[PDB]
Structure formats: structure tokens, C-alpha cells
Design an enzyme around this catalytic site. Structure first.
Site, PDB file in Angstrom:
ATOM      1  CG  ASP A  63      -1.942   1.013   1.286  1.00 14.31           C
ATOM      2  OD1 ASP A  63      -1.871   1.912   0.409  1.00 14.31           O
ATOM      3  OD2 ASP A  63      -2.825   0.991   2.186  1.00 14.31           O
ATOM      4  CB  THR A  64       2.245   3.292  -2.812  1.00 11.27           C
ATOM      5  OG1 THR A  64       1.048   3.453  -3.583  1.00 11.27           O
ATOM      6  CG2 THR A  64       3.057   2.156  -3.395  1.00 11.27           C
ATOM      7  N   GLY A  65      -0.088   4.246  -0.508  1.00  9.92           N
ATOM      8  CA  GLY A  65      -0.801   5.336   0.118  1.00  9.92           C
ATOM      9  C   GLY A  65      -0.787   5.316   1.622  1.00  9.92           C
TER      10      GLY A  65
END
Ligand SMILES: COc1ccc(S(=O)(=O)N(CC(C)C)C[C@@H](O)[C@H](Cc2ccccc2)NC(=O)O[C@H]2CO[C@H]3O[C@@H]4OCC[C@@H]4[C@H]32)cc1
Ligand SMILES: [Cl-]
Ligand SMILES: [Cl-]
Ligand SMILES: [Cl-]
Ligand SMILES: [Cl-]
Ligand SMILES: [Cl-]
Ligand SMILES: [Cl-]
Ligand code: NA
Ligand code: NA
Lengths: 99, 99
Positions: free
Chosen positions: A25-27
């Protein structure tokens, strides 16, 4: 590997001697795992996301294996709907976004 | 580009002639942006994340540029804390995760 994004980028992790499924999850700044025991000290934290905040326990210096790659960092434990591998550990496995 | 994750992966987007900042978010199925006006009819949707669910407005077939790359697809509008580019549009710009 190269992971396409047609589907959720789920991987197997090993944490606290347990295998779990988690989302790359890059967010997410932070790694957040559903309720489990971890050894050592912890302190309370609130973390936000789309629908408000949850209270979590913050454990530092936790080793995790992410799709085969070992990393160490802070893990947040609490009532997350999804296990999330955030940037604090994605960096350690050399993950990048490419387009 | 190749984007590392030591910092939040923020990019400039353009929607309705307006520049905005948004997060490239592999943990998001869909694209969600803060309140703004978009053309056409909308449909209801509920999305959920770390601290529960929010109601959003779903607009389909919206023209949106992401880091210079043109996309046309669904945009959710609502009380998200941050603008998020999710997998529905990350796939349109050719994005992958690599490690
Ligand atoms: C169906 O389509 C969707 C459904 C859900 C979402 S989401 O925003 O709820 N989310 C889903 C994921 C939790 C399964 C995407 C995440 O990437 C969000 C995206 C997000 C970012 C910021 C604020 C709200 C959401 N990040 C997030 O919850 O991060 C937490 C953990 O670390 C911190 O970093 C972030 O920055 C500090 C606060 C958050 C904390 C987006 C589109
Ligand atoms: Cl999926
Ligand atoms: Cl895996
Ligand atoms: Cl860390
Ligand atoms: Cl690096
Ligand atoms: Cl940052
Ligand atoms: Cl779409
Ligand atoms: Na510790
Ligand atoms: Na429309």
C-alpha cells in the site's frame, strides 16, 4: 518481481511467527496489522484514513518477511479492516512505483 | 518514472482544468478526490478504509491527467482526507510495483 495493478497487490507476510496476507500500500505511511500479539514494548497511537481514526498499539523494531524479503521497522496493531504494508517497510524491500 | 517511497508518492493531477496534488495509491481500488464540481450525473457509492466508511459521489468517464499521463475513468468525490489515485486509474497510466 513486477506486480501489475489489475487486482489488489496482496502478498504473504510472516510476522510474529504467523503467516498473513497483506496489501502492498503506497498510500499508507505506516504498516498496520490486525490484532495479534507482538513481543516487547509498545505505545498507543491514533492513525487516520478515509473514514476517521483508529487506536493502535505501536511496536518498534519488528522484523517482518514480505514476499520473501526481510525488513525491520515499526508495526501498528489494531482494528484495521485490511493488513497493510506501508511505505516504512516498502522502502526496505526496495519497492518502487514505475510507469 | 521510477518513484521510490521514502516520501509520499504525490503527483500533480489535472481535472476540470484545475491542478491538484494526489497520492498514487496501490492500496486503493478506486480514485477518490476531495469535494469539487464535475459534470454529468453521479451514482451513490460507499467506500471504506482505515476508520470506517464514507459516502461518495461516483462520476464515470471523467477526463483526468495524472503526472502527465491521460486517463478517462471513474472518479469518486467525497470527504476523503487526501486526493487518492487508485488502481482503476493507475492501470490506465501503466503503473506497476517493482522490487
Ligand atoms: C474503493 O476505493 C477505495 C477504498 C478505500 C480507500 S482508503 O483510502 O481507505 N485506503 C484503503 C486501504 C486502507 C485498504 C487506501 C490507503 O492507501 C489510505 C489512503 C489515505 C491516505 C491518507 C488519508 C486517508 C486515506 N491510507 C491509509 O489508510 O494510511 C494509513 C496508514 O498509514 C497512514 O498513512 C496515511 O497518511 C496519514 C494517514 C494515513 C494512514 C481508497 C479507495
Ligand atoms: Cl482484487
Ligand atoms: Cl507472496
Ligand atoms: Cl519504521
Ligand atoms: Cl532506494
Ligand atoms: Cl512525505
Ligand atoms: Cl475507471
Ligand atoms: Na520493540
Ligand atoms: Na459521467
Amino acid at each position: 518481481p513486477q506486480i501489475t495493478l489489475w487486482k489488489r497487490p496482496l502478498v504473504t507476510i510472516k510476522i510474529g511467527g504467523q503467516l498473513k496476507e497483506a496489501l502492498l500500500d503506497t498510500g499508507a505511511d505506516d504498516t498496520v496489522i490486525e490484532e495479534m500479539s507482538l513481543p516487547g514494548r509498545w505505545k498507543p497511537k491514533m492513525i487516520g484514513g478515509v473514514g476517521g481514526f483508529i487506536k493502535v498499539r505501536q511496536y518498534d523494531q519488528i522484523i517482518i518477511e514480505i514476499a520473501g524479503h526481510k525488513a525491520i521497522g515499526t508495526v501498528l496493531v489494531g482494528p484495521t479492516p485490511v493488513n497493510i504494508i506501508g511505505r516504512n517497510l516498502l522502502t526496505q524491500i526496495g519497492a518502487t512505483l514505475n510507469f
